């Protein structure tokens, strides 16, 4: 009965360009057990239409999932990814950094 906290990575499919439509991605991985909850946020408000991949896992058996949604980056509007998992005493928020 191991428990592995999820690694969370946020990124846009294309380089950020205010105005042009893009794709926001939240890849969470290396976690175990599989039960998990992910949300893509916009200024703290969980986005509604978000797609995600069916569960999968690596060779080391740790699970991973891709959560994404078509989106348009503006000069403002802070996007992030929120994760709940048995390893986190409280949700974890990883903001989307355009220059990272």
């Amino acid at each position: 009965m191991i428990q592995r906290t999820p690694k969370i990575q946020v990124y846009s499919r294309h380089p950020a360009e205010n105005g042009k439509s893009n794709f926001l991605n939240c890849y969470v991985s290396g976690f175990h057990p599989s039960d998990i909850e992910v949300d893509l946020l916009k200024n703290g408000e969980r986005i509604e239409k978000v797609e995600h991949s069916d569960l999968s896992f690596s060779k080391d058996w740790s699970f991973y999932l891709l959560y994404y949604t078509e989106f348009t980056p503006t000069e403002k509007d802070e996007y992030a990814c929120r994760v709940n998992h048995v390893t986190l005493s409280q949700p974890k928020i990883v903001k989307w950094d355009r220059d990272m």
């Binding site: 009965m1 990124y11 991605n25 057990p33 599989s34």
Partner: protein, 277 residues
């Protein structure tokens, strides 16, 4: 002598919450590309691509579904039955992966691995149940036990050594157009979070490329920078990938540096982006 995925496998994730509450999630894959989904309620597969059935007939696809459907139900059932006997503490998860792959030369090796609590539990070497060291007594007892079932063993053998190979060649061929396509990457530079006063972090982004293999490095002229730190190759839901290559550098040494990207779709024409003053 071809690019793209060279293997197929189905995975299984069975979560047991209590003695009469278990759920199973499964899917079919070509390396990291998902081609089959599995709807648990209706024990039916979900074909994600037009060519997901490979060269198999609708009749044989339905036979395989039925097979996985009863296996999924029976697996859950037997786990719940032997749970106590095997001294199992709820909740617990069991994972499985089985498939086959085409090696250069034409040989196709099959495989099957099972895990309990996120650790190896068993695997199938040369048609036999090989307990894993992290499987403890449990693994030895399960393998020793399972091999006694003529039926399930014969089915695992057929699926693994006859059906899987035949299926693989059929989907690799049927999905050739998508699997062997070449999509050029797009690169861009950015300034990452400063590693400290006077320092700077150079970030090179490469995205939208396919197939997966790719080469990205920070250069100074023709001299590769050793400090180049690759990030994980991340997925884009459209069967393309994303990768970062960073370099921790001093404010003054930035100018002169560049990011070089090589990818099979570039046909020798590498992408070179230079850091500007």
């Amino acid at each position: 002598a071809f690019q793209g995925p060279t293997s197929f496998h189905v995975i299984q994730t069975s979560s047991f919450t209590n003695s009469t509450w278990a759920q199973t999630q499964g899917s079919g894959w070509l390396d990291d590309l998902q081609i089959h989904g599995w709807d648990s309620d209706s024990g039916t597969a979900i074909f994600l691509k037009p060519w997901s059935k490979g060269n198999f007939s609708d009749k044989e696809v339905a036979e395989l579904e039925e097979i996985f459907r009863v296996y999924i139900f029976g697996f859950a059932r037997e786990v719940q039955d032997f749970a106590g006997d095997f001294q199992m503490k709820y909740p617990f998860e069991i994972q499985g992966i089985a498939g086959c792959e085409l090696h250069s030369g034409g040989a196709i090796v099959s495989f099957l691995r099972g895990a309990l609590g996120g650790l190896d539990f068993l695997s199938v070497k040369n048609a036999s149940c090989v307990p894993s060291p992290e499987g403890g007594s449990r693994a030895q007892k399960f393998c020793a036990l399972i091999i006694q079932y003529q039926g399930i063993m014969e089915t695992v053998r057929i699926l693994l050594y006859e059906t899987c190979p035949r299926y693989l060649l059929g989907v690799l061929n049927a999905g050739k157009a998508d699997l062997q396509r070449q999509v050029k990457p797009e690169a861009w530079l950015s300034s990452g979070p400063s590693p400290g006063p006077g320092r700077l972090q150079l970030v090179c982004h490469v995205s939208g490329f396919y197939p997966k293999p790719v080469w990205v490095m920070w250069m100074r002229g023709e001299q590769e920078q050793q400090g180049t730190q690759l990030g994980d190759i991340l997925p884009n839901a459209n069967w393309t990938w994303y990768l970062r290559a960073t370099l921790d550098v001093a404010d003054g040494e930035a100018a002169g540096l560049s990011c070089r990207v090589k990818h099979s779709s570039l046909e020798g024409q590498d992408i070179i982006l230079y850091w500007g003053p």
